[PDB]
Structure 1
Amino acid sequence: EYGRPFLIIKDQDRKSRLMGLEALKSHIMAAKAVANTMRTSLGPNGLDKMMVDKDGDVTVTNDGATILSMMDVDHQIAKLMVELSKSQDDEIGDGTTGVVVLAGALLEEAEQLLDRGIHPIRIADGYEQAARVAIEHLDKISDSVLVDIKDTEPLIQTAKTTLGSKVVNSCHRQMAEIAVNAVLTVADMERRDVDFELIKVEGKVGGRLEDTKLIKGVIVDKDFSHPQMPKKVEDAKIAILTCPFEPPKPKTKHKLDVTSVEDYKALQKYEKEKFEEMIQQIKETGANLAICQWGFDDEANHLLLQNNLPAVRWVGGPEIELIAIATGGRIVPRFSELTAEKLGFAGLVQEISFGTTKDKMLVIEQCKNSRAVTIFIRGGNKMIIEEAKRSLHDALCVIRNLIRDNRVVYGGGAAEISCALAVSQEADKCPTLEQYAMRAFADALEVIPMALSENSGMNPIQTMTEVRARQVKEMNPALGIDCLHKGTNDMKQQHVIETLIGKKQQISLATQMVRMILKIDDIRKPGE
């Protein structure tokens, strides 16, 4: 019956297809490539990447999440790796580049097993069982720290470990202490939750990186509304308003009919009476400085100046609520509702002026116990400011994680080596063809020490074998890679500390993503 070419799928002549191991193999290749891009950016001796945007802008960065975010990729496996990194960033905040390396190593190691005649579902099941064994072993070697305001030393050490890999390491003791102080000032301890809307991070170019400081108050990009107002107050009583300094206006449609001369004169008197009334209402309550969300008028401005009462104009809503929380005041929508109990108190309010430019800034400091805190970043480049912001965010996220759960492990590859030993020891008792998958998991779990050694300039295989032999001989899981060449392999005295939830998340998330990748055998995509 001559089965001549007949049409089944629309645009059948242009679409492509891949079936079987070849498709599978292609996926692996893509994954490996992505991992081999990130491998060099791991550890305290890692280097950085420079991304040029689609419009020409330049970004120098070290974060895995940002790196994978700014890349424009076409392969679907690359996009899956990007999303894995983004999810790890979303929950934990640190460890965004270890997870992609681990996933790439896992996929690479699965290749030889696929070549020997193993169903990929079996490989996925073996990986899952090995991951469960590793996670069960991980919390057995973990120690608690203690989270309390009095001591703050373990937290500083943890932040130091997190910041040691960034360009901010020239002053990372200072920044670590800043981060721990900010988190301890903002955090809620009964509910064990922190809120990042109460931490304001902002930077201004110029000066030096060491000029970065912590302000237990507010700082806004505004100034006083009249050029002849005083530039500082020292006993500030803040009145926070949401209504503009204008005569009232109804919202619904309205018309005011003027039908005579007496009506004209009455309206003329009413205007200035309203202005004087609002100024007197502000002054009577005892206030000393006024803050408004909207604009003023010339008459209102001169009346504020003449009555020795400075004011600020056109400040935003989030700034209003931050000032209200910091100074302990309340937000009022009318002058009639202003009372003496609704004023905030601030020890100092100042207008700071930077260098030869015309800009100004307003700082509110010496408040009482405050739930709002600001980080003020300086530096000589814009890229420096951006990277400092990212590093500070990493440190804050790590301290938050320590607040949630207070037990830690030791880094430098000690935890991975111990987990690999446990996985191999367990795999030696499994005879049901699953020992190969477990040994593949154990072998791929050892790419982090090798990457660290290769980046540090040592020889990977010999160093890893020596540390493994020492860990088996002695009975401490705290031996890692001496990256900074301080002589000792012990990470407990070198004070290299990591959170437990970070490690658990890395392992589980990488394993599940690998399992999802292994399941795919077909792919259809249009041509170009």
Structure 2
Amino acid sequence: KKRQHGLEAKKSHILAARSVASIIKTSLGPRGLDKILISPDGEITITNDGATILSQMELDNEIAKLLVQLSKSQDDEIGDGTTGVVVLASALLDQALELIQKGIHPIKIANGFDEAAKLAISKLEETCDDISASNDELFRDFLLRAAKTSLGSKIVSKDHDRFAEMAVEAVINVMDKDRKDVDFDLIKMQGRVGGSISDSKLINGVILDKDFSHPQMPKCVLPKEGSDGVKLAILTCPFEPPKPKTKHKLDISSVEEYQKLQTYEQDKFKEMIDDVKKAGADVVICQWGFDDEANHLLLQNDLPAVRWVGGQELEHIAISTNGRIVPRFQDLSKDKLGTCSRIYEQEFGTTKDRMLIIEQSKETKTVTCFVRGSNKMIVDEAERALHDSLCVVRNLVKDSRVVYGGGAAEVTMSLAVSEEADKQRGIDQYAFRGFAQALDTIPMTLAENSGLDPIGTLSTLKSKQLKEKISNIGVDCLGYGSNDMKELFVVDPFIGKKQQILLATQLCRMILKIDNVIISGK
């Protein structure tokens, strides 16, 4: 335990995360770079994501918990463009260091941010556009314009046309005709390492690591004679020869009683296969294993089955097939049968393990993007990049207002807060301008990684937005030349920038109020 008072724990505590957050600063925007982080277990995770790095990174100062606690709420709120947003989350604490040297009270610094935060949002509401005013066709065209700037962020952005139709067609299957709804829970992306990254397709369903046991039949049967969705079924109770699970004892007083125990399972072997054959269910998933003597009769009756399937994947199958998993053998009925359009096992590599793929060609509740790639490290990075796209469309649904991206929002509200600071006067004039000054570091940081003059671009933005009130002029991240964002189809959700900046401002209010740091062991 150390004794820290005064500017010791009121400055270096903020300066700590200031040097830590400057590490990921080089990853801002599509021009950013990746990083290597070795886990304590020895594994290595390579990603540029600000939330993924800070989650598994073990630091010293307790301020790291404040940065992770914010990212926990951001994933459930916005979680869109994490590489872009994570940099501006710490930009509010950098400007507060200059106001402390000037003699402003730390609480007056924190209270001055919330005053200018409500006025900056009102200015952003002027230039926002309503995408919901159009039809469904123009709405999907707005998604294609947004999926270019928004969806593509990290690596694999080389070819963005392969994943463009993946995110667009994913929200088309599950959506309301009035364009108010979201479900991101039934959409799960399970990828594999193989082939090329351009081989990704759209297959709605789940990918099971376990294949069909008893390699004495065909790997996949595409059609079905009974039609009606192949009659998918899942048994909740484990599949075993029936025996009491509770403690019991057997008493054999004669040879005949021992012979009846032989025909005991023999009568149950035929009883279990006939109840399934009577229902005609082709796909029967056993949760825990199966009986060795029944490993044949399933193929004899043409009953493909699998073993050791996780309960999480079983929930997505029943909701996708619109069926109900069978809780009890006596409760087995044709009313609980599911609907499966096509089921097959992917060849994957040479041998390896064949991956069972359940696919529904029609509208289904479980939407999945088929993903294959050569690099193993890009798997978790490319999936989580498209996982945020589920919340991107969600921001366009719940919030019909959309603003032009490219850092043009912070420049637009910069001129408003500068004018609103002169109305209050007092000591808050420099405090309100400081809140807008911290937001002015975002455009200068965007041009840092691209090799463009930070101020030379920022000076043109305020000069151009002075004559015309349109916000389409913004920072050019990828080097497209002219800074008009309307021709480049660069748009960002309104609620995305709203909450992520507001929640960061609300959190920094309590951070600047920290004076003494007391750390005790667990």
Structures share fold, TM-score greater than 0.5: yes
Deviation at 1:426, TM superposition (A): 0.9
From 166, 169, 180, the counterpart of 2:168: 180
Equivalent in the alignment of 2:284? 290
Q: Provide the rounded CA distance (Å) in 2 between the counterparts of 1:33 and 1:159.
A: 33
- Please state if 1:204 is matched with 2:198: no
Amino acid corresponding to residue 246 of structure 2 in structure 1 = T
Contact 1:347 1:367 in 2 (8 A): yes
Deviation at 1:440, TM superposition (A): 0.9
Distance of aligned partners of 1:408 and 1:381 in 2 relative to their CA distance in 1, 3 Å threshold? same
Equivalent in the alignment of 1:397? 391
Amino acid corresponding to residue 137 of structure 1 in structure 2 = K
Deviation at 1:525, TM superposition (A): 5.0
Deviations 1:465-519 (A, max 9, x none): 1111111122212211123333321112211111111111122122222221221
Distance of aligned partners of 1:16 and 1:206 in 2 relative to their CA distance in 1, 3 Å threshold? same
Deviation at 1:419, TM superposition (A): 0.6
Matched residue SS, 1:520: coil
Equivalent in the alignment of 2:62? 76
Amino acid corresponding to residue 206 of structure 1 in structure 2 = G
Contact 1:243 1:293 in 2 (8 A): yes
Deviations 1:382-405 (A, max 9, x none): 111121112111222212222222
Rg larger in structure: 1
Distance of aligned partners of 1:472 and 1:228 in 2 relative to their CA distance in 1, 3 Å threshold? same
Distance of aligned partners of 1:376 and 1:431 in 2 relative to their CA distance in 1, 3 Å threshold? same
Q: Provide the rounded CA distance (Å) in 1 between the counterparts of 2:109 and 2:339.
A: 65
Q: Provide the rounded CA distance (Å) in 2 between the counterparts of 1:164 and 1:34.
A: 26
Equivalent in the alignment of 2:153? 165
Q: Out of 61-70 and 301-310, give the one that drifted further.
A: 301-310
Equivalent in the alignment of 2:227? none
Matches within 5 A, 1:356-395: 356-395=350-389
From 92, 98, 102, the counterpart of 2:78: 92
Q: Provide the rounded CA distance (Å) in 2 between the counterparts of 1:526 and 1:395.
A: 40
From 214, 217, 220, the counterpart of 1:226: 214
From 100, 103, 111, the counterpart of 1:117: 103
Equivalent in the alignment of 1:3? none
Deviation at 1:279, TM superposition (A): 1.7
Cα RMSD of the aligned pairs, angstroms, is: 2.4
- Please state if 1:339 is matched with 2:325: no
Q: Which runs of 5+ in 1 are unaligned?
A: 1-14
State the TM-score, normalizing by the size of structure 1.
0.90
Equivalent in the alignment of 1:37? 23
- Please state if 1:485 is matched with 2:479: yes
Deviation at 1:149, TM superposition (A): 5.5
Matches within 5 A, 1:235-246: 235=224, 236-246=230-240
- Please state if 1:127 is matched with 2:121: no
Deviation at 1:432, TM superposition (A): 2.1
Equivalent in the alignment of 2:128? 142
Matches within 5 A, 1:429-440: 429-440=423-434
Q: Provide the rounded CA distance (Å) in 1 between the counterparts of 2:359 and 2:513.
A: 58
Equivalent in the alignment of 1:462? 456
Q: Out of 301-310 and 427-436, give the one that drifted further.
A: 301-310
Paired-residue identity, %: 61
Contact 2:190 2:207 in 1 (8 A): no
Q: Provide the rounded CA distance (Å) in 2 between the counterparts of 1:484 and 1:436.
A: 34
From 258, 262, 284, the counterpart of 1:268: 262
Contact 1:287 1:343 in 2 (8 A): yes
Q: Which has the higher strand share?
A: 1
Q: Provide the rounded CA distance (Å) in 1 between the counterparts of 2:415 and 2:218.
A: 70
Deviations 1:78-137 (A, max 9, x none): 432333334323421124455554354333322332222222222222222111111222
Amino acid corresponding to residue 276 of structure 2 in structure 1 = I
Deviations 1:280-315 (A, max 9, x none): 222222333433223222321222222233332332
State the TM-score, normalizing by the size of structure 2.
0.91
Matches within 5 A, 1:7-18: 15-18=1-4
Deviations 1:438-475 (A, max 9, x none): 11112111111101112111111121111111111222
Contact 1:176 1:395 in 2 (8 A): no
Distance of aligned partners of 1:474 and 1:224 in 2 relative to their CA distance in 1, 3 Å threshold? same
Q: Which runs of 5+ in 2 are unaligned?
A: 225-229
Contact 2:418 2:433 in 1 (8 A): yes
Distance of aligned partners of 1:273 and 1:524 in 2 relative to their CA distance in 1, 3 Å threshold? closer
Deviation at 1:166, TM superposition (A): 0.8
